[PDB]
Design an enzyme around this catalytic site. Structure first.
Site, PDB file in Angstrom:
ATOM      1  N   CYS A  30       0.823  -1.200   0.000  1.00 36.74           N
ATOM      2  CA  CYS A  30       0.000   0.000   0.000  1.00 36.74           C
ATOM      3  C   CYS A  30       0.862   1.257   0.000  1.00 36.74           C
ATOM      4  CB  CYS A  30      -0.941   0.002   1.205  1.00 36.74           C
ATOM      5  SG  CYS A  30      -2.015   1.443   1.314  1.00 36.74           S
ATOM      6  N   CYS A  33      -0.405   3.810   2.236  1.00 39.96           N
ATOM      7  CA  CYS A  33      -0.124   3.352   3.594  1.00 39.96           C
ATOM      8  C   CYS A  33       1.303   3.735   3.974  1.00 39.96           C
ATOM      9  CB  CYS A  33      -0.322   1.839   3.715  1.00 39.96           C
ATOM     10  SG  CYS A  33      -1.987   1.255   3.338  1.00 39.96           S
TER      11      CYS A  33
END
Ligand SMILES: [Cl-]
Length: 105
Positions: A30, A33
């Site tokens: 991600c 992320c």
């Protein structure tokens, strides 16, 4: 100072925390992320003693993800004594998060 949390210890670390808890839901691949992980890291430092900050890998911890309807990552939940008082998805800027967090402390 950011606690990595799994299905195995979510209840003790989050639900039974005496402090409010910010939970960063994430997964290995991600990019967004990755973008807020250092932002999440600084938050724990700046909220130390007042707000607990944790992270949960949704790939390896599907049970917690399901229980709290994590439909996408990164997803940020604010826990206050066992229950969700705020929710925020997407790579959010640090001061915007602090603004959102401050409203439930
Ligand atoms: Cl991350």
């Amino acid at each position: 100072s950011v606690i990595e949390v799994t299905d195995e210890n979510f209840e003790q670390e989050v639900l039974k925390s005496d402090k409010p808890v910010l939970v960063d839901f994430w997964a290995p691949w991600c990019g967004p992320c990755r973008m807020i992980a250092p932002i999440i890291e600084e938050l724990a430092k700046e909220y130390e003693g007042k707000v607990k900050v944790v992270k949960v890998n949704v790939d390896e911890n599907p049970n917690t993800a399901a229980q709290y309807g994590i439909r996408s990552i990164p997803t940020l939940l604010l826990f206050k004594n066992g229950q969700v008082v705020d929710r925020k998805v997407g790579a959010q800027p640090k001061e915007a998060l602090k603004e959102r967090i401050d409203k439930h402390l």
